[PDB]
């Protein structure tokens, strides 16, 4: 029972998804829907719904690479390499590939599961950094993030109100640089 161990191929700058599409099309060409079973390009989503970039942004686990679930045969080797725009394999010595190990496989699988379950706003704030305020009521203020929050997502922030410092609950959208 030789399982189709996963493998990785080095794509170009920003053609990974297109490379995967064309690879599936080459599969449908050569009918190798068995050997080239799975092909995956992971991603992430940072959701900052205000302040320029609006409502979402797409990242990648690791750019330039594409993941496949091929097998090891010289024919399939070329069939992977005989696609529009890919560099060689990424693994052992060239012409003798090596598989991404099953431990790393399940690791990246869990990462993919976590990023697919919860679309979560990244580009967070770290406790103790100064920052301006783009809020209406508190326009052109600046204070230090006294305590950060993620699910509540409302940035307990100390700032000079009536003299002494006071903590406020200015939400993410009302937070400027850093």
């Amino acid at each position: 029972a030789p399982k189709k161990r996963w493998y990785v191929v080095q794509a170009f700058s920003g053609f990974e998804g297109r490379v995967a599409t064309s690879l599936r099309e080459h599969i449908k060409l050569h009918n190798m829907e068995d050997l080239f079973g799975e092909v995956m390009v992971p991603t992430e989503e940072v959701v900052e719904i205000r302040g320029g970039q609006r409502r979402k942004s797409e990242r990648k686990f690791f750019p330039g690479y594409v993941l496949v679930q091929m097998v090891m045969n010289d024919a399939s080797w070329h069939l992977v390499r005989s696609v529009p725009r890919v560099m060689g394999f990424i693994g052992g010595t060239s012409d003798r590939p090596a598989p991404i190990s099953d431990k790393e496989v399940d690791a990246i699988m869990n990462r993919l599961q976590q990023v697919g379950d919860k679309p979560r706003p990244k580009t967070l704030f770290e406790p103790g950094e100064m920052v301006r305020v783009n809020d209406g009521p508190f326009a052109d203020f600046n204070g230090v993030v006294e305590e950060v929050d993620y699910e509540k997502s409302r940035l307990k922030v100390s700032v000079s109100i009536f003299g002494r410092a006071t903590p406020v609950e200015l939400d993410f959208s009302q937070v400027e640089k850093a």
Binding site: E126, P127, G128, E129, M130, V144, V145, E146, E147, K177, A178
Partner: protein
């Protein structure tokens, strides 16, 4: 901008130093007790350490803390450490000698990232963050641009806890007095390191220093053009506690001069 953890650390050090100054003008409130060799430790140490720990936990309830008194308080996390000395030169604060400082540095993955020392008597605030440098009250710090062991000033410390090396130490100093101009001795490792990074003294060296007595100054002298090492050119100074520091030329000259006078126990 300003490094976040650096801002928290400098606020905490400011509060601790204000408490220090408050305890200073009252030669009555200090109620010390002897713990080591020819030095006390005061209640003020405990008060300042408490203030620092509390201010840190306010904005960081999980970071690991390190202190001469509380040893190592392992927070729920163990990659972000805060090495703290609420007082460097407690001997001086006993005699109310106005030369001491509070010291706070942060280690990430074992690498010191931010560091501050604070002299409340002159209101001097040596800050330093990795990859951005060291500042004295808003001025950059480049260390003494001296290029040789001539005319230099050498800050040092006498090992009042490990006086066995004294003789050897003496010889070292003696040898150094053949070339250097003058020495300096303030009984405050952190402020010695700062002055080195401040370009006020052109080199510092000490035999057997405590880990939390340089972990803040060492980043200062690093990002102020200077380098640090042990007495044999290696990086084990964090364990041996044997420190030399200063601009590369003077450090190289000192090491070349001391290669012989030193003892095999130290190397």
């Amino acid at each position: 901008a300003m490094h976040p953890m650096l801002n928290i650390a400098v606020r905490a050090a400011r509060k601790a130093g204000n408490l220090i100054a408050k305890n200073y003008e009252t030669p009555d409130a200090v109620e010390a007790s002897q713990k080591g060799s020819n030095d006390f430790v005061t209640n003020v140490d405990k008060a300042a350490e408490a203030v620092i720990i509390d201010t840190i936990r306010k904005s960081y309830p999980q970071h690991t803390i390190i202190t001469e008194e509380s040893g190592e308080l392992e927070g729920t996390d163990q990659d972000v450490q805060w090495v703290i000395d609420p007082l460097d030169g407690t001997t001086n604060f006993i005699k109310r000698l106005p030369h001491f400082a509070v010291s706070i540095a942060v280690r990430i993955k074992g690498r010191t990232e931010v560091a501050v020392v604070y002299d409340p008597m002159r209101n001097e605030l040596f800050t330093a963050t990795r990859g951005q440098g060291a500042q004295l009250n808003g001025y950059r710090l480049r260390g003494s641009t001296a290029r040789d062991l001539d005319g230099t000033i050498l800050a040092t410390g006498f090992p009042f806890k490990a006086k066995q090396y004294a003789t050897t130490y003496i010889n070292i100093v003696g040898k150094l007095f053949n070339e250097c101009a003058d020495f300096r001795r303030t009984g405050s490792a952190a402020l010695d390191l700062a002055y080195v990074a401040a370009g006020r003294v052109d080199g510092f060296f000490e035999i057997g220093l405590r880990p939390w007595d340089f972990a803040a100054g060492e980043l200062l002298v690093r990002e102020a053009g200077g380098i640090v090492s042990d007495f044999t050119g290696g990086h084990n100074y964090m364990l041996t506690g044997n420190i030399v520091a200063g601009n590369p030329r003077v450090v190289k000259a000192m090491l070349a001069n001391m290669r012989d006078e030193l003892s095999d126990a130290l190397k």
